[PDB]
Amino acid sequence: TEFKAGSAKKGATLFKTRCLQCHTVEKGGPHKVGPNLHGIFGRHSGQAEGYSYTDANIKKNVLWDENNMSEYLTNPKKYMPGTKMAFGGLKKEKDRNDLITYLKKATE
Numbered sequence: 001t002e003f004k005a006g007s008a009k010k011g012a013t014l015f016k017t018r019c020l021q022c023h024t025v026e027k028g029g030p031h032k033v034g035p036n037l038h039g040i041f042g043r044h045s046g047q048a049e050g051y052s053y054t055d056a057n058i059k060k061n062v063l064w065d066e067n068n069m070s071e072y073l074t075n076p077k078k079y080m081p082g083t084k085m086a087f088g089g090l091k092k093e094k095d096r097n098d099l100i101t102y103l104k105k106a107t108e
């Protein structure tokens with residue numbers, strides 16, 4: 001790995017202030033701007049039923065792993081050009097560690 005866990009309580013917060021905006025995490029939460037995150041990891045890109053994902057996302061066939069996801073939150077549009085992720089990224093290794101510790105806990 002190239003991912004080191006961090007603060008789950010730190011993640012929780014980043015995510016509110018940075019992605020709640022368009023997404024929900026709990027099982028049985030709805031899609032909003034972006035898709036619902038429950039059971040993301042180990043899950044392949046663009047596969048939640050009832051959501052219309054860019055053709056970009058869909059063909060990236062990304063395999064969602066803490067590792068995968070970090071590169072991804074860095075700058076998604078570079079990662080998958082054409083995605084309608086309206087997110088410039090988490091420039092910082094730490095915030096990102098924080099968040100995916102979060103995301104790895106809350107989406108499970």
Ligand code: HEM
Pocket residue numbers: 015018019020021022023033034035040044045046047048052053054055056057058073082083084085086087090099103
């Ligand atoms: C905040 C740091 C943040 C997270 C975390 C996040 C996660 C994320 C993932 C992992 C996907 C891929 C989906 C898949 O099911 O395979 C994804 C997709 C989209 N997002 Fe998101 N996202 C974060 C930030 C933001 C913000 C702040 C918005 C809205 C302003 C947003 C929106 C979207 C959209 C739209 C998509 C789908 C893209 C496509 O089909 O190309 N995200 N999100």
